[PDB]
């Protein structure tokens, strides 16, 4: 009655307090960011959401550091971005074709768990485990990729909600 509510508010505070630019619309209120919302659309457990948050933060720090060492420049990331976009399109099409019969949230779980495991081409580099997930989460935060074929409609429903 009280421990559940304090737990839920602590969860909201922990999950939703940061972004590239804290939006004043989501400053006094704790609306989850786009990527965490896209995760909650399929209803992943809580600890998986925490893992995703950590991946996103660590990837941001790594990109900052690599830029601040002069090892990377602007043009480096564009090929990676377009490769991610093209790969996600192909895998989205394949997942839709193969398992159209399953419940929609099941399709979301599927795509979410296949897109991350597959490797992605890039330069002479050794990306640690927690890099590609963070880039995917940044892309999701921009609504360029999604974990649901009609994630956009559910997202309008949520903003209305």
């Amino acid at each position: 009655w009280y421990k559940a509510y304090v737990q839920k508010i602590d969860r909201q505070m922990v999950l939703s307090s940061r972004a590239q630019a804290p939006v004043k619309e989501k400053a006094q209120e704790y609306l989850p960011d786009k990527f965490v919302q896209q995760l909650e659309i399929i209803g992943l457990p809580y600890e998986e959401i925490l893992g995703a948050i950590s991946d996103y933060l660590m990837a941001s720090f790594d990109r900052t550091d690599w830029a601040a060492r002069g090892e990377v420049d602007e043009t480096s990331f564009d090929d990676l971005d377009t490769a991610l976009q093209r790969t996600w399109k192909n895998k989205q099409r394949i997942c839709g074709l193969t398992h159209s019969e399953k419940s929609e949230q099941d399709q979301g779980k599927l795509l979410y768990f296949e897109c991350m495991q597959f490797n992605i081409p890039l330069q002479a580099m050794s990306p640690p485990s927690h890099f590609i997930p963070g880039c995917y989460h940044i892309l999701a935060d921009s609504l360029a990729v999604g974990w649901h074929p009609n994630y956009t409609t559910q997202l309008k429903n949520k903003k209305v909600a």
């Binding site: 990109r63 900052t64 830029a67 601040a68 002069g70 564009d78 940044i138 892309l139």
Partner: protein, 164 residues
């Protein structure tokens, strides 16, 4: 999204200050106080905004000359003769960034681009409130300019193995 960090960490509003300090340090030790040639301006950031070379510039102190800085790369105990050649490639890679830095430098009345492929630096301006970290890149740029001043074009080109 995938470039915000880089764009913030390598903004031309810092390259402008670095080039300003480089010119102000080059004129001081020039034999006839002539400001530097235009091409050498492209070699400031590709050396100061790369850690492995900035450390070399930081170690050998002022009275060592450019020759010692160049020689440190080939030392047996260090064995980094490949970075010397990569300086030129990296300088090629960053043409636009240095170009924008120069633009901001002149447009702010820090350098006057004469119609002679030359850039007169300006005095009577000082910043304040900067961070400690950049407050070392500035002095490194000044020292590098002073080193460039004492020599001529051919000697510098041979020492840094640049191709202009």
């Amino acid at each position: 999204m995938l470039a915000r960090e880089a764009q913030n960490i390598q903004n031309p509003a810092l390259g402008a200050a670095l080039v300003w300090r480089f010119c102000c340090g080059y004129v001081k030790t020039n034999r006839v106080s002539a400001p530097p040639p235009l091409p050498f301006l492209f070699l400031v950031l590709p050396i100061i905004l790369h850690q492995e070379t900035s450390e070399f510039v930081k170690r050998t102190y002022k009275s060592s000359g450019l020759r010692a800085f160049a020689a440190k790369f080939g030392d047996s105990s260090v064995s980094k003769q490949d970075l010397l050649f990569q300086i030129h490639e990296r300088s090629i890679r960053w043409r636009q960034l240095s170009l924008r830095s120069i633009e901001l430098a002149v447009a702010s009345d820090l350098l006057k681009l004469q119609d002679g492929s030359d850039v007169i630096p300006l005095s009577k301006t000082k910043a304040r409130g900067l961070s400690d970290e950049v407050k070392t890149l500035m002095d490194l740029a000044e020292k590098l300019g002073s080193w460039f001043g004492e020599l001529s074009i051919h000697e510098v080109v041979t020492t840094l193995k640049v191709k202009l």
